[PDB]
Structure 1
Amino acid sequence: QSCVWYGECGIAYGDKRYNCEYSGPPKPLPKDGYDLVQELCPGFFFGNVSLCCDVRQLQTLKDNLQLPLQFLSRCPSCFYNLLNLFCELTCSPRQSQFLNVTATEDYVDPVTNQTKTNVKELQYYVGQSFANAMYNACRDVEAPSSNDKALGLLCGKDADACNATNWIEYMFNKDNGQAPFTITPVFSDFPVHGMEPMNNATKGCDESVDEVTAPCSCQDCSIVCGPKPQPPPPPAPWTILGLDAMYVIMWITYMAFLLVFFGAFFAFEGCLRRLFTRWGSFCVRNPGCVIFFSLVFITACSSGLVFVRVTTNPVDLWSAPSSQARLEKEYFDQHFGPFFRTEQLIIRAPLTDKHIYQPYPSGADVPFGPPLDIQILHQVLDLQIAIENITASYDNETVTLQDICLAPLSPYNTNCTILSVLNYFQNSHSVLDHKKGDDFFVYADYHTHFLYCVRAPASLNDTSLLHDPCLGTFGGPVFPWLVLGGYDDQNYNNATALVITFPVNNYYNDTEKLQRAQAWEKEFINFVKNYKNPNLTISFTAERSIEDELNRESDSDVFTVVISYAIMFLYISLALGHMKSCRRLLVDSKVSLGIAGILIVLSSVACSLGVFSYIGLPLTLIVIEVIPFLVLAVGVDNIFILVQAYQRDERLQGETLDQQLGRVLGEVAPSMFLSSFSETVAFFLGALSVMPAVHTFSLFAGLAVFIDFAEDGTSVQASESCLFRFFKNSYSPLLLKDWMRPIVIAIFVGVLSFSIAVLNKVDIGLDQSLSMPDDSYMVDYFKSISQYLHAGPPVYFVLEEGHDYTSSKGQNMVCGGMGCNNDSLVQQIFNAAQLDNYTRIGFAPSSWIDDYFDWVKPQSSCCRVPEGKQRPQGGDFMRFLPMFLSDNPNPKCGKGGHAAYSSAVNILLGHGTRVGATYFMTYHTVLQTSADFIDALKKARLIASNVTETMGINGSAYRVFPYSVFYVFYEQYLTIIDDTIFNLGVSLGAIFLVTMVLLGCELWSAVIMCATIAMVLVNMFGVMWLWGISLNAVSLVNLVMSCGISVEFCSHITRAFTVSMKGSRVERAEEALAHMGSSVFSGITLTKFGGIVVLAFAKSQIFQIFYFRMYLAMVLLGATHGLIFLPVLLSYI
């Protein structure tokens, strides 16, 4: 083994040295060079480390690595072979085999005058295969942020002219101003005149350099690339449903035809109860006090229980508690509580054009969208600074953004967190205004930094001539997707919108601090609303917009319903007693039910919004049945009055009917104890139902009687009219309603198929105020970013190997997410992840860093490591040490010094084994619809299952958690399918069982009433999934009420028809329905007559425009079916 040089001699040019000629054997490297050799040329680091280089040469090699690193650092395999080319030249103990000195000159030591010899030039015999592999591993590497190949910057020519041998030739030519002296390469896989070319093994860009150094990326490599995604599923059925409906229709038609052809070819208990009731009445018919006294008692119980009208309604608790939805939210809290909320603005520049700007030294045309005009950025910065300076007052105190913001690096840094493109310029007008240029070029400006910072937002030093940091003033990177909108692919320069985001404390556990934050928010909303700049359109996130709009909009419409309620109760008042006899009752009846309900609920605590539309419209049941019992008696007139004339007309039609009506109602509201977020309003009303029932018992009858004994004339006429109507109805049924009845069946059939073959969750569409609209419009337009978090809490974490396995799970999750997409982009996640396992790894290969104590004090630097061999081991496993260091950070360590810390961990003392709870979050955009977010949530749950299902263990111990400002809120829209089927199902049983608690005709009554259950439902669904309909936490309650009123109708028509004393074919039926038809047109008609004022009327928002919309439609359909349904059933019988 022999050298050609050893050590450094004279200056060549600049700061550059020739090496000293030396032709002896290699020399063991001093221990003081072991770090350098381990770092640069670890292949030589064994035995006596006998090399043809000294420590000075290795230091010089390290110092010269800056420019290759500048362009190749991202692809370790590419850089590795290059380093080996230089290591072999500099240090190989067999230099003489592949190097031949070709020029020299004297070196004279200035002090001793001893002569040595500069190696001025030499020839280097490089393997052909080595050179080609070195080029091959680097040829796809892309410059840090640039569609140009890194080799175009290291080859003295463009990348399309760069080849393996001319690249090496260029690097080795002193003319390049970097190489200290020229090395002339000769490329051969064969010996050349006894020289044995350097042909060291090489690594491709698809290979790992070592155990702690991964292969190169796709973006910077070719070998390790592909394949894209191919898991797209395409479903689409439905026609089947249509065919079935059609088939059914055909069958029906056939049946009808057949029928036509044929015609051409040819109880005790109940009674007893009634009797008892009558007896009671007769007794009661001997005193008014008792009754009223009872009403008075109810006046108290109702009002009494209403003590402390604390009937809350806020804030966002309707998904109900318990289960996973709530339990999951609570869990994430104990670990961190409320991650926090964001006030967010989207900003566009409608009066500004795009523009071009060549960035040195490429000079390629890069277009920049309207909002990235330099002047609009300055204007957006002024907006931003003004927002930071907003103050609100609460009590006598002042509230700033600095009091409520996420300031991640407090106290050492109170700097608030503002996600904005302006934070790439540290929110500084001057810094952004800067621009290093001369008479010839602009070398660096607000463009270069931008194009660099979108690729390296954590950088504390632009690689351009500006040398400005990218890191935001809050101490963390601002990711480009989260601050720009309306750009294509990752061409952030083409953005048509800026997004500005301020995280502020939600203060879920602190009431006094939350109120202060909400005071600030109100000022923020005001500031934005009144901000004047023709150059910018600014639009909303906040908090009140969604909470203030609902409480600010939902009011005017009140006057609508209120009015309608009055005009309706007026008619129902005129109807029967007309005068001041019936009015009193009702007013008391409606009050009793409403008052009683509030009292029944006060004994358990509860409250709600829709709980009002139900309470009011629900009261109808009490009025309807109550409005027909009195009317029927009015139509009475025999040998008796008051005495038996009241018990024979009351305990005869009111006993059974009412008795059955009250039950069918209590069964729908009573058994409302189910599982969901509506049982409260439900039960409360159902309870108010028996109450309202027992009320109108002796109260209405007695009162109506006690007092019942121009106005008279009017009553008679109405009665007469009713009678006439009944007669007409009878006549109609007499003819033949078989054809139309079949047609009706068709309508129901078509409805079931059209209603069962549509569906939907529920979106958010509030009135057109302003704020809310802006946020809704901005969201629709924007895209790519704006977020929620998927999040896991994990336990244990102590077995180096289980951490490696958990990291593989984590990396795999990042992949699927960055893949799963839809239409023209991903849907699932976003997405990507920054747990921490990578931070630790980075440190192992990094250095220390400075911490500067606040306000003053000497600098503190402290740390260490642990390479080379150990380095790989340390990073591989163990974790207490790393963990306790990694949690305490706030100043990088290498070429700069910034902040790169976080949170989520919280062990005790130095028990690193007890660490919790690491949390990884990938924010994904959506804002599509109630069904869109629900679909994404559905995917995330399966994602959580897949990760937890992959590698589990013992029983239970934490799992996946998808907490996104949309869950708990949409969590309900999840089990909506089972709810509807379960909710209605529970009523179908309570109704079929109740209607039998005083009958049990097997198929007679059972089917009669049972048919009404599916009869009306198909209508509600049709209108909902058919025309102007909807569905949600309310619609579900809507369907419930529907089945309720429906039961009411049927109940009366049927309890008196089924029996039928003097029985017949279809004659007795027409007789009963007659006395029941008059009431069907009274309450029903009126009720509709009221909705119209509510439905046919107007409003200032679609909100109720639907709620009270279907009501009238669904309520109307049910009423119509009442008469038809009964008639059809009778005929069938």
Structure 2
Amino acid sequence: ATCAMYGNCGKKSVFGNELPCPVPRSFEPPVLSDETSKLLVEVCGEEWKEVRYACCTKDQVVALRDNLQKAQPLISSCPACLKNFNNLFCHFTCAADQGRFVNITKVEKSKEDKDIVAELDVFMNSSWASEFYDSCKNIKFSATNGYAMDLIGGGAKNYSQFLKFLGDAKPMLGGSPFQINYKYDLANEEKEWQEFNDEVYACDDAQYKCACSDCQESCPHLKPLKDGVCKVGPLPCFSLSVLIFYTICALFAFMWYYLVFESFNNETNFFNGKLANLFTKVGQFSVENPYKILITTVFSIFVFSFIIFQYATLETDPINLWVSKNSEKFKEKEYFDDNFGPFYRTEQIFVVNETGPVLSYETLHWWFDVENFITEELQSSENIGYQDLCFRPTEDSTCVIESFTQYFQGALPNKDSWKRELQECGKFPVNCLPTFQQPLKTNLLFSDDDILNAHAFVVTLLLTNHTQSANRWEERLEEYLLDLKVPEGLRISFNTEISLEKELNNNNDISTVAISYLMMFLYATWALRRKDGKTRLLLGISGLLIVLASIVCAAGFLTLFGLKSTLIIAEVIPFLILAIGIDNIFLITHEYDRNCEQKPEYSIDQKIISAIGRMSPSILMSLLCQTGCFLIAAFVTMPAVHNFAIYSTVSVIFNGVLQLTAYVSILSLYEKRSNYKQILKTFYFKMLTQKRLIIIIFSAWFFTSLVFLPEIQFGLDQTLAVPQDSYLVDYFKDVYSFLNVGPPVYMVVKNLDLTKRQNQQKICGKFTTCERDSLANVLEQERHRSTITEPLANWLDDYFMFLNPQNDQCCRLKKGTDEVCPPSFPSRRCETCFQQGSWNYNMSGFPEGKDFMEYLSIWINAPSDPCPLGGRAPYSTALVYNETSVSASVFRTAHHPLRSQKDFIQAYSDGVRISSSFPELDMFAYSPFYIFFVQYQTLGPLTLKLIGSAIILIFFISSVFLQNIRSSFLLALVVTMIIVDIGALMALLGISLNAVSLVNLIICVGLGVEFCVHIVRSFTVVPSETKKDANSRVLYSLNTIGESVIKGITLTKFIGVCVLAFAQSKIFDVFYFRMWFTLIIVAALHALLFLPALLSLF
């Protein structure tokens, strides 16, 4: 054996550790003693048994042994690094070839004048150094909760710097006693010095595995790439698909140019015959008994008026309106609320210094004297302060105030060192535990982590609620904050849960809605004037009281069945009926009016029966089409959409009944007591010669609208939902601006044994032997791609760490018994529950049987003050147990800011995706907002089926009545053009797709068929007098049933809507005006210009 060093030669400094004694290479080391060999192998390993002629003695191994142990806690987390760390120094002093890779440089004289090496040069393989640095790269310290490389390598970033800290001459701070040159440049041809090269280990090594938290290699690297979208190029994939179709499709058509079956099976034929006879009897009975039918209608609007007012009439809460109770997300919310309690009521308050940082001597002193008012002496009318309602982690501990005031224990820190004191707490919240023993992250409290330069702070107050007493407290808080007089240069934007249920029901848009409908009545009376010029006000006024009587009858009839009328019903239902119910007034009146001429059945009562007989079949067929469209939506899942599907289907059926029996009686009565003597629709419509041009223009419009379809965005911005100029406008605009923390995410695990070792390894995140794709590792690796980018609050890891023997303060039991040893008995009789040699980082002595609970109860009740690892404060309400098994548990994770509607839907997908990413765990992710955004997942395919199925109904409900497949297909061809055209202006007009929009898009089909169905039927059931040809019939219908549309639904809904543009609410202006102003212009264009041109070319 050859050694360049051996033995010990005094010390280089008084009152200091001794220094090795350099020796030349000529000498040979003596045989090691028995004691030295046993100690050397124990500290280093079993591989040293073969070698028994090392270059170290008893005095050297003991010194080396002591120095290795002191560094053991730092690197004990990752055994791979620990082995490498000890291997380097073990071969430094005991390698038989010590001088081969260690070259002495200078020698000095010690206190005894012996030989002591001042410095030496050590050479090693570059790859070996990289592996060593890689092994200890990401080791995480326990107490510091941060990278352990800082303490061992001084924050080194490369192996060259890290190794230098090891070899640097630092006699102070327990460092090395001499300088060591870890050079990386040597040649093997010297024949005297060879770079050190021995076994090395890495994190990925199967033998010396390391926890994923301690090394990236161990973490699950599979992580299959997430992809659930179809986009190609700068446009959506469907847009490219449609555009590509036009190019290729046009090629086939261009080359070609350059180069009713219903007679059979007359069962349907007889339908058009008996139906007219049936309505003739209804018309006959409604004209011969006008009083018997009018009294009942007046009686019905009295009995139903009784019900809608007194017997029962109720609205619904925001949760009921939006989310269906059967949705899987809501079923999960009930489980979370039932077990882990409802989520806290959050009352955010923002203090903003627009042009600088809020933190100052004036504001810090001022806010402390206003945050001590809200949380101390703000008794509401019921005389309940915040303390009564505030949320306490446990009864002993005070409640939580997520504000920077909680730093300094809520007391003034004096105007001498506030800047310095606040900075320290933010960096390490553990050492500044608030009065509730819960760490406060700086991201939540402050907008900017700089703290001193932060431009605002968050004063979120969390209430556990006390059964409607909390609801009353926010009233005082809401009033109090508004009345606050903040100093110059500051502003307050706040929020309170009462705001959503209070601010929402505060709009005064009824003024504009009432006026708009008032104008509709005024025009309707003047639009019923006779051909000569007489004005039938009594008929129009009475006719408008029948359409408004159907709403009351339906709105009161359903309240008899327990249905609740949503606030949406107050707008959509009146609009639909005033359109369906106004067309029938003009069609029946004009048909009678045209029956005044031609003197068919001169008798006044006969002129009406003929009028009903001619026009009722189209009215009934349109009614079935509109009933079928809404009835389909009744199969939807959302309750607000489902609610409308039931109201409209009834508000329209009742309208049909009152527009064929009650109104006919009014018409019969009015005309009889009036006895009026019989004294551009053709000039312009003669332009029908431009048939091909109209089809081309309207066909190009449809095709161009088909490529903008996939550009529609989902979601409903809440900022517009509430009335404008509110106190929320400066909050919602500020929650997306100065808030850097997203909603909490609760990874609820259910029915997992969590006692047998096998199950514990699926949640471990800090131990080695646990499964690679555990709950923590998977969620740790998903912090970089998913929207869930905040550390997991793993209680299982904390519980096991609490048992660590090194944490003597945390766990302590009385000797000879399992009784706990609280701080009230500081006598040193108590010892740690787990022995030093039992607990290991590789889950060796961890509880497996009933002992898991024997220590979980001790942990969960730990004070948490003596040491940061405790259970009472952080994880007392996180897990549900019954002394035998953990029924369920929760791992709070939290989202990222989520400051847009697209992000909100994106966040929900991550919860559903991650929830399903674990097939071995009965797990689900709960966040407060998940229930609201459940619909948007299937809102894409859903609206295809609801609208796609409605079109088929139009083609099938109107096929029997028309008995002409060609005319029925065209009717369904123009009804689909309207929605597709309206479906592309939604993207262009900035109207999103949601429940509020989905219902509106359904009544576009219900109202789109209203315009076109009448014209198509008159084109197919023309009287024998007119010629039987495409052009003549089309011209006849527009003269006959075209004026009833231009002066009826078209203008009636266009005169009132135009004035409706002056609505103040942003939600009403977006989803209810920009969509009912587009279906009255798109449908009017498509029914009065496209349809006459299309039918002529049927």
Q: Using structure 2 for the length normalisation, give the TM-score.
A: 0.77
| SS of structure 2 residue aligned to 1:681 | helix
Count, aligned residues: 1001
* CA 1:232–1:303: 2 relative to 1, 3 Å: closer
Aligned position for 1:802: 759
The answer as to whether partners of 2:746 and 2:893 remain within 8 angstroms in 1 is: yes
Distance apart, 1:336 and its partner CA: 1.4
Aligned partners of 1:79, 1:683: CA distance in 2, in Å? 71
Aligned partners of 1:373, 1:42: CA distance in 2, in Å? 57
Distance apart, 1:1037 and its partner CA: 0.8
Aligned position for 2:388: 403
| SS of structure 1 residue aligned to 2:563 | coil
* CA 1:906–1:184: 2 relative to 1, 3 Å: closer
1:599 aligns with 2:557: yes
Aligned position for 2:1085: 1120
Which residue identity does 1:916 align to in structure 2? S
Which residue identity does 2:400 align to in structure 1? C
Distance apart, 1:242 and its partner CA: 4.1
Distance apart, 1:1111 and its partner CA: 0.3
Aligned position for 1:847: 807
* CA 1:513–1:52: 2 relative to 1, 3 Å: farther
1:732 aligns with 2:735: no
Aligned position for 1:412: 396
Question: Unpaired runs of 5+ in structure 2?
Answer: 1-5, 20-29, 50-56, 187-195, 260-268, 529-534, 765-772, 813-819
The aligned runs of 1:575-614 (5 Å cut-off) are 575-576=527-528, 578-614=536-572
Which residue identity does 1:241 align to in structure 2? V
1:275 aligns with 2:277: yes
The aligned runs of 1:139-154 (5 Å cut-off) are 150=150
Aligned position for 1:762: 716
* CA 1:1071–1:1097: 2 relative to 1, 3 Å: same
Distance apart, 1:566 and its partner CA: 0.6
The aligned runs of 1:756-795 (5 Å cut-off) are 756=710, 758-766=712-720, 767-782=723-738, 784-795=740-751
Q: Using structure 1 for the length normalisation, give the TM-score.
A: 0.75
Which residue identity does 1:539 align to in structure 2? S
Aligned partners of 2:574, 2:258: CA distance in 1, in Å? 47
Aligned position for 1:748: 702
The answer as to whether partners of 2:400 and 2:436 remain within 8 angstroms in 1 is: yes
Aligned position for 1:975: 938
Distance apart, 1:484 and its partner CA: 3.5
Aligned partners of 1:974, 1:335: CA distance in 2, in Å? 27
The aligned runs of 1:407-806 (5 Å cut-off) are 407-408=392-393, 410-420=394-404, 422-430=405-413, 433-434=416-417, 445-446=420-421, 449-450=424-425, 453-454=426-427, 456-458=428-430, 469-486=431-448, 492=450, 496-505=454-463, 507=465, 511-519=467-475, 521-523=477-479, 526-527=480-481, 530-552=484-506, 554-555=507-508, 557-576=509-528, 578-620=536-578, 621-637=580-596, 638=599, 640-642=601-603, 645-677=606-638, 678-709=641-672, 725-733=680-688, 735-756=689-710, 758-766=712-720, 767-782=723-738, 784-797=740-753, 798-806=755-763
The answer as to whether partners of 1:278 and 1:647 remain within 8 angstroms in 2 is: no
Aligned partners of 1:856, 1:148: CA distance in 2, in Å? 30
Question: Unpaired runs of 5+ in structure 1?
Answer: 30-36, 106-118, 190-198, 259-266, 353-369, 436-443, 459-468, 821-826
The aligned runs of 1:359-378 (5 Å cut-off) are 370-371=357-358
Distance apart, 1:803 and its partner CA: 2.1
Aligned position for 1:241: 242
1:995 aligns with 2:958: yes
* CA 1:521–1:273: 2 relative to 1, 3 Å: same
Aligned position for 1:1109: 1074
Aligned position for 1:298: 300
Aligned position for 1:1042: 1004
Aligned position for 2:318: 315
Question: What is the CA deviation profile of residues 684-710 of structure 1, one whole-angstrom value per residue up to 9, with x for unaligned ones?
Answer: 121121111111222111122123219
Aligned position for 1:1077: 1042
* CA 1:240–1:494: 2 relative to 1, 3 Å: farther
The answer as to whether partners of 2:350 and 2:493 remain within 8 angstroms in 1 is: yes
Aligned partners of 1:761, 1:770: CA distance in 2, in Å? 22
The alignment yields a C-alpha RMSD, in angstroms, of: 5.5
The answer as to whether partners of 1:141 and 1:151 remain within 8 angstroms in 2 is: no
**Which deviates more, 888-897 or 68-77?**
68-77
Question: What is the CA deviation profile of residues 258-291 of structure 1, one whole-angstrom value per residue up to 9, with x for unaligned ones?
Answer: 9xxxxxxxx5443333234333443444434421
Which residue identity does 1:828 align to in structure 2? T
1:931 aligns with 2:906: no
**Which deviates more, 370-379 or 160-169?**
160-169
Which residue identity does 1:769 align to in structure 2? D
Question: What is the CA deviation profile of residues 716-749 of structure 1, one whole-angstrom value per residue up to 9, with x for unaligned ones?
Answer: 9xxx9xxxx433355233x443322332222222
Aligned partners of 1:882, 1:212: CA distance in 2, in Å? 27
The aligned runs of 1:130-209 (5 Å cut-off) are 150=150, 170-171=169-170, 173=171, 176=172
The answer as to whether partners of 1:668 and 1:1044 remain within 8 angstroms in 2 is: yes
The answer as to whether partners of 2:423 and 2:451 remain within 8 angstroms in 1 is: no
* CA 1:154–1:856: 2 relative to 1, 3 Å: closer
**Which deviates more, 1118-1127 or 704-713?**
704-713
* CA 1:886–1:253: 2 relative to 1, 3 Å: same
* CA 1:851–1:697: 2 relative to 1, 3 Å: same
Question: What is the CA deviation profile of residues 605-656 of structure 1, one whole-angstrom value per residue up to 9, with x for unaligned ones?
Answer: 2221221221211122112212321232123222645565235433322321
Question: What is the CA deviation profile of residues 823-847 of structure 1, one whole-angstrom value per residue up to 9, with x for unaligned ones?
Answer: xxxx521122121222133123243
* CA 1:1085–1:417: 2 relative to 1, 3 Å: same
**Which deviates more, 307-316 or 888-897?**
888-897
Aligned partners of 1:582, 1:631: CA distance in 2, in Å? 12
Aligned partners of 2:792, 2:1034: CA distance in 1, in Å? 72
Which residue identity does 2:413 align to in structure 1? S
Aligned position for 1:264: none
Question: What is the CA deviation profile of residues 400-454 of structure 1, one whole-angstrom value per residue up to 9, with x for unaligned ones?
Answer: 1x2233322x22211424254x54544443278448xxxxxxxx9337615xx43
Which residue identity does 1:345 align to in structure 2? I
Aligned partners of 1:518, 1:1051: CA distance in 2, in Å? 54
Which residue identity does 1:634 align to in structure 2? D
* CA 1:668–1:379: 2 relative to 1, 3 Å: same
Which residue identity does 2:970 align to in structure 1? I
